[PDB]
Amino acid sequence: ASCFALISGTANQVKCYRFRVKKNHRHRYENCTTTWFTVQAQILITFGSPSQRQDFLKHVPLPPGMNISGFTASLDF
């Protein structure tokens, strides 16, 4: 896809957020990554379209202390 979201926070916040979104909002997103770091926990969520992501943003609450950035990306090579 080309529609994404990056969620940040503690390892636990990130892990439980993903768990919630997966058990309760599976239809609101395409795929999700396991937790990763930079060599703050981070997970990448993909979306099949801006709509799905819009719907996601409207039903999934961003817990206190957590971050979320929206991205649009294109494949180069």
Residues near its own copies (CB under 8 A): 12, 15-16, 19-20
| Cβ within 8 Å of residue 34, ≥6 positions away | 43
- Beta carbon of residue 28, minimum distance to its own copies (angstroms, whole number): 18
The Cα–Cα gap between 56 and 17 comes to 13
- Beta carbon of residue 27, minimum distance to its own copies (angstroms, whole number): 18
CA nearest neighbour of 7 among 73, 66, 72: 66
- Beta carbon of residue 42, minimum distance to its own copies (angstroms, whole number): 18
Specify the residue, 8 or 52, whose C-beta has the smaller distance to its own copies: 8
